[PDB]
């Protein structure tokens, strides 16, 4: 016999669209002069990128 | 990189008045990095007696604060520009005497190109060239 077992956190993804916010280095912009592409409003990115191979 | 440029050396006479300009540029536009936040002290260096503090002028509203020995005879005015990244600072000493001959320096308190030093007004990095005022007959 078999019974349904629900698993949370399975490594399953589906193709979809979403809202992609912005992150940038603090040192990239001078922090004194404005930019046409607003960099101050972007969240500060992590110093060490977290890239995971699959 | 804030740079302060002063006026040329002046030779006056006792009882005259000297007005030394101080051009400041490179502050920046963002609040806390603008000329309307960093005071412009005026320091006198008499040869032999060391440096002397004369007063500071805060360029937002022109709030000045003179030293006790100079009250009633020194006046500071500003010419803060539109972008507030630059400006000009003036000092007038209206009761020049023979003991006022020295080199006058205008200074600010912005050490670094990316730090907000608005509330730390006594780190006098950007010294001006120095205007050698000579008062004699």
SSE diagram, text form:
This is part of a larger assembly, with chains A (about 55 residues) and B (about 140 residues).
Chain A: E1 23-24, E2 43-44
Parallel strand pairs in A: 1-2
Chain B: E1 3-6, E2 10-12, E3 18-25, E4 40-46, E5 50-58, E6 63-66, E7 74-78, E8 86-93, E9 102-107, E10 131-135
Parallel strand pairs in B: 2-10
Antiparallel strand pairs in B: 1-3, 3-8, 4-5, 4-9, 5-6, 7-8, 9-10
Organism (chain A): Human immunodeficiency virus type 1
Protein name (chain A): Envelope glycoprotein gp160
Family (chain A): Belongs to the HIV-1 env protein family.
Report on the structure:
Chain A: Belongs to the HIV-1 env protein family. Chain A: This is Envelope glycoprotein gp160. Chain A: It is found in: Host cell membrane; Host endosome membrane; Virion membrane. This is part of a larger assembly, with chains A (about 55 residues) and B (about 140 residues). Chain A is largely without helices or strands. Chain A is built from no helices and 2 strands. Chain A has strands spanning about 25, 45. The radius of gyration of chain A is 20 Å and the shape is elongated. The relative contact order of chain A is 0.20. By secondary structure, chain B is mostly beta strands. Chain B is built from no helices and 10 strands. In chain B, a hairpin with a 4-residue loop joins strand 5 and strand 6. Chain B starts with a strand and ends with a strand.
Query: Oligomeric state of the chains?
Result: part of a larger assembly
- Which structural class should the secondary elements of chain B be placed in? mainly beta
In spatial order, strands of the major sheet of chain B run 2-10-9-4-5-6
Largest sheet of chain B: 6 strands, mixed
Number of helices of chain A: 0
β-strand percent of chain B reads 35-45%
The total of helices of chain B stands at 0
Shape of chain A: elongated
Q: Taking Cα atoms only, what radius of gyration of chain A do you get, to the nearest Å?
A: 20 Å
Strand elements of chain A, count: 2
Q: What is the first-to-last residue Cα distance of chain B?
A: 40 Å
Q: What would the principal axes of the Cα set say about the shape of chain B? A: elongated
Biggest interchain interface, per-side counts: A-B, 5 and 6 residues
Q: Helices and strands of chain A, in N-to-C order?
A: EE
Structural Rg of chain B: 15 Å
The share of residues in helices of chain A is under 10%
The number of distinct β-strands of chain B equals 10
Strand order of the biggest β-sheet of chain A: 1-2
Q: Percent of residues of chain A in beta strands?
A: 5-15%
Helicity range of the residues of chain B?
under 10%
Cα separation of the termini of chain A:
34 Å
């Amino acid at each position: 016999n078999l019974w349904v077992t629900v698993y949370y956190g399975v490594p399953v993804w589906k193709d979809a669209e979403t809202t992609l916010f912005c992150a940038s280095d603090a040192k990239a912009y001078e922090t004194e002069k404005h930019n046409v592409w607003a960099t101050h409003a972007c969240v500060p990115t992590d110093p060490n990128p977290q890239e995971i191979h699959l | 990189h804030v740079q302060l440029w002063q006026s040329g050396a002046e030779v006056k006479k006792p009882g005259a008045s000297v007005k030394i300009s101080c051009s400041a540029w490179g502050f920046g536009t963002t609040s806390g990095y603008s000329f309307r936040d960093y005071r412009v002290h005026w320091v006198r260096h008499i040869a032999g007696q060391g440096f002397q503090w004369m007063g500071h002028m805060q360029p937002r509203y022109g709030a000045v604060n003179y030293a006790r020995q100079f009250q009633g005879r020194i006046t500071m005015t500003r010419e803060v520009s539109f972008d507030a990244s630059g400006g000009t600072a003036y000092m007038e000493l209206r009761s020049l005497r023979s003991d006022d001959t020295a080199v006058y320096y205008c200074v600010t308190h912005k050490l670094y190109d990316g730090e907000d030093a608005s509330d730390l007004t006594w780190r006098l990095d950007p010294w001006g060239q120095g205007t050698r005022v000579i008062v004699s007959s």
